[PDB]
């Protein structure tokens, strides 16, 4: 398989072992009742950086929680803090593919389009190799 | 965590102004919520290992106002109910590592039930 | 409020001539037909500067707006015939800002609806909250 | 008629004396009747300060063509360099207001919305004084 | 006709030559059709002129992208590692026109508005010469 599939493989599983709710593999554009609480792991800015001549890449890694329309921010928060966070610290087989990893931001961001849902965003900052 | 309760004392600190108030900038407005508090983050981001995990982001106040109206009435608003709560809130203070003006935005409702104008600082803490 | 005094400054200047266009404290968003031809005053960008010091800076905007179906070309006589004269002199406006430059001028359309095109004179302005 | 005014007429007169609609200025919604449209616009006009008691500018300036509906990019370059580039080799008008041209770019856009229209958009970085 | 023309198609050409599959475009579809899908995209974007060297030469993103409807992207890298990756591995036809070619990034995109399909991004960073 190809390293990005190996990568949220890793975290997604780590997921599934561990919390009620519907995973998607990439970032969702749409969602049926069904699936909420949402919980997606993926990647964005994956881009080369070896011209130093390294084959080394880097990457945003992210796990984002989506619930169902209109939330207070804390209620995401507390899914996070309870559902999330704890799983993002043993993860051995995220390890092995990756050459360093490091908190990155944590976002917040919602349905500007139709209201449907609002989001919390954790995300690490990853190098590897392809 | 940390956010909830960083929002939370401005939230508890703006409680004490015949608002609705939302944690976290609102999608969808109802237009009974008008005038519209929020308070939240944006570009909160890890920065590094002081020993204790440093964090930095950006603090939002922003008021809407229904439909249309002048820029200034919402200046006016952000005058007289926000800046004075602004000034003093311990809660925050003690959360935080350090707190500074960042800017002063005005948006509105691009696709128009809503105009706003929203302050900011930028903050740093533990989390 | 430091902001409502400086487009204030700049707003009854420039509304103080003939000119039967429609002023607004702020960049509206939606624009009724009979609003044109429309002059809009806003601030954009706005941000504290500061070295211990209260400098503040921010983007001082004039925007002319007509039915979109314009030139270029109108939107520009518009402005050297309008806004420019009233522009090179503000007392009103000197006496708030600490310093005003050039900065840029740019032109925009209505995508959506397409229902006017604009040009949008701005300046770059530093002040004290 | 200001400079601004005077830099687009330049290269729009170049444009006539030689064969579709012209538009002074980037348009927003066409009509069916104005493909093939030539846009000449200009974008990023800003102050870079004061030479010789003189005012200095720098802006980008743009001659774009629309094509009827979504199509290959290779047809946009086809009419690019057969109709666009010609009269782009030496315009005396245009030369006698600037103070410095070269090129920027080649960019390609598309009514995201809808295969309403497909564009191939060449510009120049030129600077003149106001 | 012209260099943009060339490039693209050196790419398309050793597309289609190794997995007729999916229908390919000639630079960035606005809208598909339900049934193009798979859709195979090949495109430039800011590409811009670097200079002159005895010769003027320019700088690009060469893109290769890959549409389905909303599917895990894992589908994605899978078509991207099986009918991309091998073909991209080295095309002559495409490396005798160029400068220089260098990997840049991965990315992957969707549709935000109907959702209708989901895509895997694949771009180099190319110099040439017009």
Do not use: C, N
């Amino acid at each position: 398989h190809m390293k990005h599939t190996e990568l949220r493989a890793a975290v997604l599983d780590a997921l599934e072992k561990h919390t009620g709710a519907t995973f998607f593999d990439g970032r969702p554009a749409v969602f049926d009742e069904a699936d909420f609480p949402a919980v997606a792991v993926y990647l964005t800015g994956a881009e080369y950086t070896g011209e130093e001549l390294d084959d080394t890449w880097q990457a945003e890694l992210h796990i984002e929680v989506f619930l169902p329309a209109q939330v207070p921010d804390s209620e995401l928060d507390a899914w996070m803090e309870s559902r999330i966070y704890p799983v993002m610290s043993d993860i051995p087989a995220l390890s092995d593919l990756i050459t360093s990893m490091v908190a990155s931001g944590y976002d917040y961001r919602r349905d500007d389009d139709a209201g449907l849902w609002s989001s919390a965003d954790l995300t690490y900052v990853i190098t590897y190799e392809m």
